[PDB]
Amino acid sequence: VLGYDKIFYGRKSTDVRWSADDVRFSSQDITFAKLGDQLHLGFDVEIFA
Amino acid sequence: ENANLPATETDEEVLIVDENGSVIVGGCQYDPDESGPIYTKYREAKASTNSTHTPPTSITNIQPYITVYRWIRIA
Amino acid sequence: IYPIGTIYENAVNPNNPVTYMGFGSWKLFGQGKVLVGWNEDISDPNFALNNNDLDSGGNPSHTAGGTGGSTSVTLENANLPATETDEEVLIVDENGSVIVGGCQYDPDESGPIYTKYREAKASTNSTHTPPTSITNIQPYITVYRWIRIA
Amino acid sequence: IYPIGTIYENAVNPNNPVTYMGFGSWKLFGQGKVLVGWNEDISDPNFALNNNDLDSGGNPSHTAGGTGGSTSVTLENANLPATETDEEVLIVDENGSVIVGGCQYDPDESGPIYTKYREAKASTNSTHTPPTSITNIQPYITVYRWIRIA
C-alpha cells in the first residue's frame, strides 16, 4: 500500500479473518522491525516491502 | 538488592511503548468540548514496584543452633 | 579433665557416650541443633538471652542454651529489592502527554474495539505469596552429639 | 577418653593428632561442613538424615556424617512474594472502561500520536534474570580441625 504516513505493505490478510485475526497481526508487526528474515515464517500471507 | 531478582513479567498484559506498536493513542483526542472525559494514562516511564521498599528487611540465615561458649584453653 | 558442659559429644557410635568414655554417664544433646557461639559479648546478636534464656525482665547472662533462625525462608512485600520493569510503560496521572479521550467517534462499533482495562496496580507473580524458600543451611555434616552428663 | 572415630579438633598447629595431640593420628572430618546433632528423629531437613548415608529404600539411619547446606542460594521467580505496581497504570482487559479506540478520526497528519506497544506480559528485570544470589550462612568459626582416626 501507499500512504501519507508511510510507503508500506500491511498484513494483507488471508483465509478467514476472525477474533484471532487481530492477535495474528501483532506477530507481523514486530516482524516489520525484525529484519532477521526468519521470524514466524508466516503462512498467513504478508509483505514487508 | 535490586540486582538480585529473577526477571519478572506482569501476570497479565499491558501497553509497552514501542514505535512499531499496534494500538494507537490517535494523533490527538477529538475533544470538542471539555465534557468529553479527559485523562492521561500518563507518559511511559519505569514501572514502580515497592518504592515502599528502600533497602528491605532481611530474612535470617543461621539455623536453630546451640549458642554456647566454645572454651579454648588459652595455652 | 572433662567437666559437664565442655564440648560434649561422640562422633559416630549409635549408643550412648558412657560405653566408651568410661567415666560416668553422658546424655545425648544437639537434636536438630548446631554448635554456635554465645559469647561473653553481651550485645552480640545470638549471645545475650538465648531463647529459653531470660530473666523475667528478659536478661539472661551473656550465655548459652542458644537458638535462632532456620534454613529455608522467603519474602514479604517489604522483603523485596527496588523493582522497576524495563520497557517504558504508561500509567495514570493528571499531568500526562498521552490524551486518553473520554468519548469520540466510535460511530462504527465495527472498528476493532480494543479497550485495555483500568489504570491499576500490576500484579507480579500474584499466583503465590509463598515463594521458594532458600535454604540457609550451610554445608553441614550432621555429627553425633551425646553430651557428657558429667 | 576419645572413642572410636573421634569427634575431635585443634585450633592451631600444622599437623595431625600424632605430632600435636600425640595419641593417634588425625584428619579433618566435615571439611567445609558445619557440625549438627543427628537426632534419633530423622525429620528436620538439614538436621535429619544423611546426605551420604541412606537406605537402598532411601532411609538414612539416624546417624552422623550426613550432609546439609551449601554456599550460595539464588533467587528465582519461584522465590518472590505477590506484589502490586506502585501507581495506577493501565493493564489490558476486556471489561475495560477506557477504550483505546478502534481507529483514528484523525484528519490531519503530524499532530502527535503514539504507538502504545502490543499489550503483553510486562517485563521486570529481564536485563538481569539470573541475578544476585545472597550467602545463606553465619560468620565462621572455622579452623583446621584434625579429627584423630582412632
Description:
Chain B: It is found in: Virion. Chain B: This is Baseplate wedge protein gp10. This is part of a larger assembly, with one copy of chain A (49 residues) and three copies of chain B. Helix content of chain A is 29%, strand content 0%. Chain A has 49 residues and is mainly α. The relative contact order of chain A is 0.26. Chain B is an all-beta fold and 75 residues long. Helices cover 0% and strands 21% of the residues of chain B. Chain B has no helices and three strands. Chains in contact: A-B, A-D, B-C, B-D, C-D. The interface between C and D is large, with 82 and 85 residues. Strand 1 of chain B pairs antiparallel with strand 4 of chain D, so a sheet runs across the interface.
- Helical region count of chain B? 0
Strand content of chain A: under 5%
SSE order of chain B: EEE
Helix amount of chain A, in percent? 25-40%
Beta strand count of chain B: 3
Q: Give the terminus-to-terminus CA distance of chain A.
A: 9 Å
Helix fraction of chain B? under 10%
Structural class of chain A: mainly alpha
Main sheet attributes: strand count, strand direction, barrel closure of chain B? none
Counting helices, strands and paired strands, the structural category of chain B is mainly beta
How many β strands of chain A by DSSP? 0
Could you give the order of the helices and strands of chain A? H
End-to-end distance of chain B, in Å? 44 Å
Protein name (chain A): Baseplate wedge protein gp7
Family (chain A): Belongs to the T4likevirus baseplate wedge protein gp7 family.
Organism (chain A): Enterobacteria phage T4 (Bacteriophage T4)
Subcellular location (chain A): Virion
